[PDB]
Amino acid sequence: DVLLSFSLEVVIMEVQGLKSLAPNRIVYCTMEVEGGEKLQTDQAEASKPTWGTQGDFSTTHALPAVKVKLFTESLEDKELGRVILHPTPNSPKQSEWHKMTVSKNCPDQDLKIKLAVRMDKPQNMKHSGYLWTIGKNVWKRWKKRFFVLVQVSQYTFAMCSYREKKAEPQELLQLDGYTVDYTDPQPGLEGGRAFFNAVKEGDTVIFASDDEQDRILWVQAMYRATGQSHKPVPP
Numbered sequence: 001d002v003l004l005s006f007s008l009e010v011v012i013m014e015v016q017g018l019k020s021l022a023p024n025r026i027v028y029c030t031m032e033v034e035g036g037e038k039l040q041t042d043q044a045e046a047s048k049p050t051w052g053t054q055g056d057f058s059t060t061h062a063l064p065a066v067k068v069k070l071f072t073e074s075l076e077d078k079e080l081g082r083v084i085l086h087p088t089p090n091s092p093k094q095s096e097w098h099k100m101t102v103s104k105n106c107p108d109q110d111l112k113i114k115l116a117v118r119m120d121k122p123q124n125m126k127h128s129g130y131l132w133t134i135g136k137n138v139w140k141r142w143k144k145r146f147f148v149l150v151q152v153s154q155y156t157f158a159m160c161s162y163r164e165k166k167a168e169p170q171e172l173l174q175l176d177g178y179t180v181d182y183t184d185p186q187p188g189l190e191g192g193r194a195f196f197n198a199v200k201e202g203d204t205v206i207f208a209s210d211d212e213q214d215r216i217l218w219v220q221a222m223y224r225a226t227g228q229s230h231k232p233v234p235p
Contacts, residue, residue: 002150002158002169006089007120008033008057008064012041013095014050015070017111018080023047027080029113030069031055034165046072060167062128062148063088066117070100079103081111086164088146089128093118124151127221132192132208133161138171139205142189145170149221157225159198159205173198173205180222181232182215196232198222 010031018027025046032038041053057066066085071077081100095116102111127149134142145161148169152158156176160169178198185195185208192208194215199205209215219232 002152002160002172003060003167004062004122004125004148004150006059006062006064006122007118008059008066008087009116009118009120010039010055010057010066010068011095011116011118012051012053012055012068013114013116015081015100015111015113016097017108018046018049020107021046021072021080026073028071028073029053030071031057032067032069033057033059033064034061034067035059035064061165062162063146063164063166064119065165068113068115070111070113080106080108081113083113083115085115085117087117087119089119089121089125089148091117091119125149126151126157126225127218129209129214129218131218132189133205134189135173135205136203138173142191142206144191149175149225151225155227159222159225175222175226177201178203178222178226179228179230180219180226181230182219182234198226 012029026043027049029041037057039055041051069082070080081102083098083100097112097114100111131147132144133139148160159173163170178200180198183195183197194209194212196207196219
């Protein structure tokens with residue numbers, strides 16, 4: 001019921017390491033997100049395996065898996081390699097070279113593909129990232145999870161953790177009534193560098209970021225999400 005909908009754009013650029021194929025062999029790529037949405041690039045010749053192809057997808061998964069497969073056609077079609085990408089809304093939107101897994105029955109071992117993968121920021125998502133966290137009633141084990149701060153109403157907000165390839169958060173915390181602030185590193189919690197918490201009558205959630213620049217952005221975002229009057233006290 002706390003649903004996000006992301007635009008996912010995949011721009012397949014080119015491949016390198018395609019030496020075995022004849023120059024006039026047709027190559028193309030398929031790009032798919034788990035859930036049903038699949039797209040193909042145009043046909044390219046092996047002499048020039050390049051596409052300026054933008055594939056526009058759309059998913060409910062904050063942590064989707066993007067499977068890109070390279071094919072040569074003409075007995076079905078032969079897959080020459082694949083990559084599986086795991087992008088987040090914070091992932092780099094630059095073009096990136098990736099190594100493709102090759103069946104080792106074809107001599108294209110240094111076979112790589114250049115790719116851009118972009119997840120847009122929907123308007124009801126205020127902030128996302130990975131965080132160390134433990135709580136009294138939710139996230140009851142010190143563990144790093146992926147979080148999204150979703151605006152669930154004109155005045156209500158929610159801290160939502162997600163698992164891989166899930167449309168709905170695994171757990172969530174309604175932030176109304178909570179007070180967030182920076183805290184000194186809490187003892188006995190192995191993992192986490194820059195700590196903070198969300199606290200209220202009855203509940204306490206401990207948070208830790210790996211970097212303090214990432215902690216500042218979180219604490220400030222959550223301060224506005226809770227509507228607390230207490231201003232956080234940084235170090």
